[PDB]
Design a protein around this ligand. Sequence first.
Ligand SMILES: O=C(O)[C@H](CC1CC1)Nc1ncnc2[nH]ccc12
Length: 164
Amino acid sequence: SFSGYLKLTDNVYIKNADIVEEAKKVKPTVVVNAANVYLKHGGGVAGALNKATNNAMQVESDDYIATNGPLKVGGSCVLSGHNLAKHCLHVVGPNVNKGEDIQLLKSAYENFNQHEVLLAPLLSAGIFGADPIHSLRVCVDTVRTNVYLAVFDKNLYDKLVSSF
Ligand SMILES: O=C(O)[C@H](CC1CC1)Nc1ncnc2[nH]ccc12
């Protein structure tokens, strides 16, 4: 059900789209969230996905943290996708703005290999502070399963395609 994506490699496709709108239309098996270790979904992709679930994602996430404690930077957990997808894979890329190691970005993308097909954002981009060109390069060099990347900003999408 994914449509309008540009093919970058055998397994990586990209589109200029709002990942929330894309999840509502497609209802994928897995949507990836750009999470933090506490699963506090305040802003960016996490805030937008959570708002679209009417805060059900945050209620489920607070119960997960109360039981299990925080995730690691580079780690992930599988929770419900609520009204957006079957599952949500919450993946923690390093936040440069908070001083986290950029080498952990490859470990973060390795989580995608546990799922056959995913709708995802570029990890560590936006308010996480990493260079999005670098994030797309690490994605294409790490993920082996089928990943459909939604890039929100039009100008960034054009820059990523032309420089690939
Ligand atoms: O458009 C995106 O998909 C990302 C993440 C954002 C959607 C949460 N945006 C950006 N990422 C890196 N540098 C940027 N400069 C301006 C925008 C921008």
